[PDB]
Ligand binder design. Structure first.
Ligand SMILES: [Mg+2]
Ligand SMILES: [Mg+2]
Ligand SMILES: [Mg+2]
Ligand SMILES: [Mg+2]
Ligand SMILES: [Mg+2]
Ligand SMILES: [Mg+2]
Ligand SMILES: [Mg+2]
Ligand SMILES: [Mg+2]
Ligand SMILES: [Mg+2]
Ligand SMILES: [Mg+2]
Ligand SMILES: [Mg+2]
Ligand SMILES: [Mg+2]
Ligand SMILES: [Mg+2]
Ligand SMILES: [Mg+2]
Ligand SMILES: [Mg+2]
Ligand SMILES: [Mg+2]
Ligand SMILES: [Mg+2]
Ligand SMILES: [Mg+2]
Ligand SMILES: [Mg+2]
Ligand SMILES: [Mg+2]
Ligand SMILES: [Mg+2]
Ligand SMILES: [Mg+2]
Ligand SMILES: [Mg+2]
Lengths: 119, 101, 73, 88
RNA sequence: AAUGCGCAGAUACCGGGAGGAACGCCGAUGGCGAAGGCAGCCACCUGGUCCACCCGUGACGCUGAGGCGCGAAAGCGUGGGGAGCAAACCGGAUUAGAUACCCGGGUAGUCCACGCCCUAAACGAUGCGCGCUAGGUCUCUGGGUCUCCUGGGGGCCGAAGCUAACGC
């Protein structure tokens, strides 16, 4: 109940789950979703299917505040990074843009050993 | 006495009063540190790449100077001491390197 | 082949130490902010060494970005 | 850094005759000028070990030329020492 | 999967702040250093090196037992610091068991200053110097009459030759 028409959708990709925040054009959340929210327990969530309904859920929830179109920001390299984007296109929302924006350090903190590989 | 280049980026939105006041102190702080000032370019404000000091713009300067080396670092800090002075980049002067000339 | 558009050809008789020159300097950066590889700058080993030292300097002045954001992904 | 106008003063001084730039005196003199500057650098900056190796070599090149000079002209040696006041 | 975190509202998102640490791209087929080793940017201080001129000294050279200095990491002492990471440790899993690999925590430590320690697959597993003995090709950095010639450095291929062989 706000009538924002336009806003932003942040897709957050990850190997373990995919989550999607929808947001007014200043970055304040309107609604969100993820694979858990959709229904999935541990481990499916990361699946591309999860991300499909995750994104669709979020958009359906945002059509309620009468959104017509959004900008897409995607961060993460997970599975179903794209399926979240496809789903927002076929969502009926108008995707005005897509922008990768996964954060990376200019060599900052020591990774956890699972992300260290070698030298 | 070596040839440097004093780079200074002060706040974008002032006026020919507070701006001319900082200008005064730069001219002041330059000279009182033994810096003759070979030439100058006040290349206006420009749109910054990323926002510095919360401002998307920044007023620029460029004093090509000669001065004793042993007093360069201090000059840079005394240049930096004001709050409306956001970057100071003192660089040793070098001959151009025309490539694809 | 791998012989698309280079950079060194695109411009002319430019100084390689002019960290204040931007419209020239910004031609050597990624779609993002990343400094371009020699295979795409077409600079000599030594030319490219000097490009960094300045593109970096130019970054500190806030004339050149350190990083950006990939459009249309 | 020791620039030209200083290096001159030294050579011109310790030269054996106008134009001599590489006689043992002129070298031992020149080197001594370099050692002294380096030892000051190393009174602060004790942690600069790479430079300290430079100095070990300069000291070594000097005591090498003196060792030669105190065998070719041992009164011309006595004089260089006095003139600098070194090796003692 | 669970432990764990979350309605004292977390995860995702926006703005502001504090801090500790490390410097993406450029970047290697690269460079520097005697070795260990050395990468944001600026300034000062300072070491080694290469080339051209062929100017000066006139065998002043090489090597080097002892000595003296330097020496990744871990480790120690005294203060300081402490973001992330993480021996020990505390838990969740797995398993026949699992004092492990996987998962959630976590202290010393990792960082600084000063002082110790003196080790290593400290490796090219190849001591230093000089002279001699086909070439080709790629590359870093000088010089010149600059299709190329001439130095210094890093690779690859190979003459002679060597090697137990691999190789050189
Ligand atoms: Mg609970
Ligand atoms: Mg409640
Ligand atoms: Mg958070
Ligand atoms: Mg924040
Ligand atoms: Mg803190
Ligand atoms: Mg290499
Ligand atoms: Mg080497
Ligand atoms: Mg090594
Ligand atoms: Mg030097
Ligand atoms: Mg001669
Ligand atoms: Mg003679
Ligand atoms: Mg040690
Ligand atoms: Mg240590
Ligand atoms: Mg300690
Ligand atoms: Mg403490
Ligand atoms: Mg941890
Ligand atoms: Mg653990
Ligand atoms: Mg302790
Ligand atoms: Mg220490
Ligand atoms: Mg040439
Ligand atoms: Mg060679
Ligand atoms: Mg043969
Ligand atoms: Mg054979």
């Amino acid at each position: 109940k706000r009538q924002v028409a336009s806003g932003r959708a942040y897709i957050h990709a990850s190997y373990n789950n995919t989550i999607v925040t929808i947001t007014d054009p200043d970055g304040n959340p309107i609604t969100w979703s993820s694979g858990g929210v959709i229904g999935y327990k541990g481990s499916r969530k990361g699946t591309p299917y999860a991300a499909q309904l995750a994104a669709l859920d979020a958009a359906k929830k945002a059509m309620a505040y009468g959104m017509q179109s959004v900008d897409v920001i995607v961060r993460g390299t997970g599975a179903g990074r794209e399926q979240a984007i496809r789903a927002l296109q076929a969502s009926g929302l108008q995707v005005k843009s897509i922008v990768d924006d996964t954060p990376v350090p200019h060599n900052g903190c020591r990774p956890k050993k699972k992300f260290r590989k070698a030298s | 006495m070596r040839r440097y280049e004093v780079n200074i980026v002060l706040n974008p939105n002032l006026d020919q009063s507070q701006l001319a006041l900082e200008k005064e102190i730069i001219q002041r702080a330059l000279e009182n540190y033994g810096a003759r000032v070979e030439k100058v370019e006040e290349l206006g404000l420009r749109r910054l790449a990323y926002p510095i000091a919360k401002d998307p713009q920044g007023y620029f300067l460029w004093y090509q100077v000669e001065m004793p080396e042993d007093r360069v670092n201090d000059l840079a800090r005394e240049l930096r001491i004001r709050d409306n002075v956001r970057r100071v980049m003192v660089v040793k002067s070098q001959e151009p390197f025309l490539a694809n000339a | 082949p791998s012989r698309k558009a280079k950079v060194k050809a695109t411009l002319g008789e430019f100084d390689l130490r002019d960290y204040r020159n931007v419209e020239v300097l910004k031609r050597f950066l990624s779609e993002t902010g990343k400094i371009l590889p020699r295979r795409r700058t077409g600079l000599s080993g030594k030319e490219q060494r000097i490009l960094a030292k300045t593109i970096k300097r130019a970054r500190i002045l806030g004339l050149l970005p350190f990083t950006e954001k990939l459009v249309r992904k | 850094p020791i620039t030209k106008e200083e290096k001159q003063k030294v050579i011109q001084e310790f030269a054996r005759f106008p134009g001599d730039t590489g006689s043992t005196e002129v070298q031992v003199a020149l080197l001594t000028l370099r050692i002294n500057r380096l030892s000051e650098h190393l009174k602060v900056h004790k942690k600069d070990h790479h430079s300290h190796r430079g100095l070990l070599m300069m000291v070594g090149q000097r005591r090498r030329l003196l060792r030669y000079l105190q065998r070719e002209d041992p009164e011309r040696y006595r004089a260089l020492i006095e003139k600098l006041g070194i090796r003692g």
